[PDB]
Write a protein that binds this ligand. Structure first.
Ligand SMILES: Nc1ncnc2c1ncn2[C@@H]1O[C@H](CSCC[C@H](N)C(=O)O)[C@@H](O)[C@H]1O
Ligand SMILES: [Zn+2]
Ligand SMILES: [Zn+2]
Ligand SMILES: [Zn+2]
Length: 426
């Protein structure tokens, strides 16, 4: 159980890209990699584990830095190679914490010296990672320049000048890689909990209608095909969240990756209309309130989320339909708030209402829908609604074994329920 399945090559115009070498079936795993470097992002920090990135109500805090919090003593140990150095820095920053991108790039710079190679850099190393120096706007260069003066500052302790780092390695150029080659680490419940750098995965170009999706069983990362992919076909993923219009997607892809998405979709404006059904006036105020809420989600702060959600869904009932992406986003948030708070009746109220949009927005098999759908069925089973629960849990499996695969332990939970939902229609 080893044979290779992808490879790099030269695109007509868009740089370096992956391709199948033999035909692929949907649900097939193609690549698998640990991070070259990864870190629990500022919000999740103090809430999740500093290694395995898992949420265990209580956490043991850092010996000498008292910032980094651990799952166990074993998690705390194999974390040394990485935490060894950074402990000192964070220690005397207190409380000011380094913006993720830095604390990451701090960790990376030593994992370059590691000597014996990494799997993460098997097909594409760090120094190959496209940075887009040319044709990068000012206020962005002026943006990255800042981070450098912040990095050097934050690091001081272990790094006083560029002579302590390998040559050809350049800091400003390195943030330019990490602005546009980072990876959002999503946990079980499809929550963002960290940022990684997977320099073989970064060989994947962008379609808003991808054929590959990636899922995070902790910091470990899986790339699978979601459809039938023929020899010589360039493999692609969507770097963005699926709840954005072509116009929102255009703006963000210029601001980060410097390009035009020339997918069949970004030209015809797929789903675009359906996304903003309702009067612009109505939801403007919702896409505004979405900038607050989304913050407090990442900071695992549910109680205020549930205030700002209830009030606003209670408000726009008479006028704004669920299928409106920004309305919907509050609905997912609404659901997510209720789950972590244990209001599982309310939880199901909100979750079931989102079910249908999701179907029209996330095509064939998307792991976001998967988990969402799972949370629904799982919410239903609990409520004792066995028939339609078996319906959704089944659906979840039809999505998830192609999105997550057998190698994901989440699947385990899924089947258990299906055999336990069997037990309640006894
Ligand atoms: N759909 C698309 N259209 C045009 N350029 C794209 C694209 N997807 C990715 N890119 C380019 O590739 C970068 C993402 S990294 C993905 C692989 C890239 N060829 C590389 O050398 O690493 C972006 O910053 C952008 O320069
Ligand atoms: Zn420490
Ligand atoms: Zn841990
Ligand atoms: Zn596009």
């Amino acid at each position: 159980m080893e044979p290779l399945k992808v490879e790099k090559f030269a695109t007509a115009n868009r740089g370096n890209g992956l391709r199948a070498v033999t035909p692929l079936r949907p649900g097939e795993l193609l690549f698998r990699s640990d991070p070259l470097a990864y870190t629990v992002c500022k919000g999740s920090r103090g809430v999740v584990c500093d290694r395995c990135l898992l949420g265990k109500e209580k956490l043991m805090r850092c010996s000498q830095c008292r910032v980094a919090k651990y799952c166990s003593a074993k998690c705390q140990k194999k974390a040394w190679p990485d935490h060894k150095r950074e402990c000192k820095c964070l220690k005397s920053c207190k409380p000011r914490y380094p913006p993720d991108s830095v604390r990451l790039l701090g960790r990376v710079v030593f994992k370059l010296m590691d000597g014996a190679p990494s799997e993460s850099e098997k097909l594409y190393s760090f120094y190959d990672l496209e940075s887009n120096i040319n044709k990068l706007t000012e206020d962005r260069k002026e943006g990255l320049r800042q981070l450098v003066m912040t990095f050097q500052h934050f690091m001081r302790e272990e790094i006083q000048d560029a002579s302590q780092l390998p040559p050809a390695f350049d800091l400003f150029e390195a943030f330019a890689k990490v602005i546009c080659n980072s990876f959002t680490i999503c946990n079980a419940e499809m929550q963002e909990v960290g940022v990684g750098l997977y320099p073989s995965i970064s060989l994947l170009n962008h379609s808003c209608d991808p054929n590959c999706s990636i899922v995070f069983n902790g910091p470990h990362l899986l790339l699978r095909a979601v459809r039938d992919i023929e020899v010589g076909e360039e493999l692609t993923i969507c770097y963005l969240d699926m709840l954005m219009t072509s116009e929102e997607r255009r703006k963000q892809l210029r601001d980060q990756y410097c390009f035009e998405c020339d997918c069949f979709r970004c030209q015809t404006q797929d789903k675009d209309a359906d996304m903003l059904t309702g009067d612009e006036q109505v939801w403007k105020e919702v896409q505004e309130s979405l900038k607050k809420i989304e913050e407090l989600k990442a900071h695992w702060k549910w109680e205020q989320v549930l205030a700002m959600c209830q009030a606003i869904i209670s408000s726009n009932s008479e006028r704004l339909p669920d299928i409106n992406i920004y309305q919907l986003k509050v609905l997912d948030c609404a659901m997510d708030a209720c789950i972590n708070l244990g209001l599982l009746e309310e939880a199901l109220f909100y979750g079931t209402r989102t079910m249908e949009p999701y179907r029209i927005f996330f095509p064939g098999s998307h792991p976001v829908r998967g988990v969402q759908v799972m949370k629904v069925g799982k919410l239903q089973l609990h409520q004792g609604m066995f028939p339609q629960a078996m319906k959704n849990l089944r659906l979840a499996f039809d999505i998830m074994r192609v999105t997550h695969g057998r190698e994901h332990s989440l699947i385990e939970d899924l089947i258990l329920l299906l055999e336990e939902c069997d037990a309640n229609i006894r």
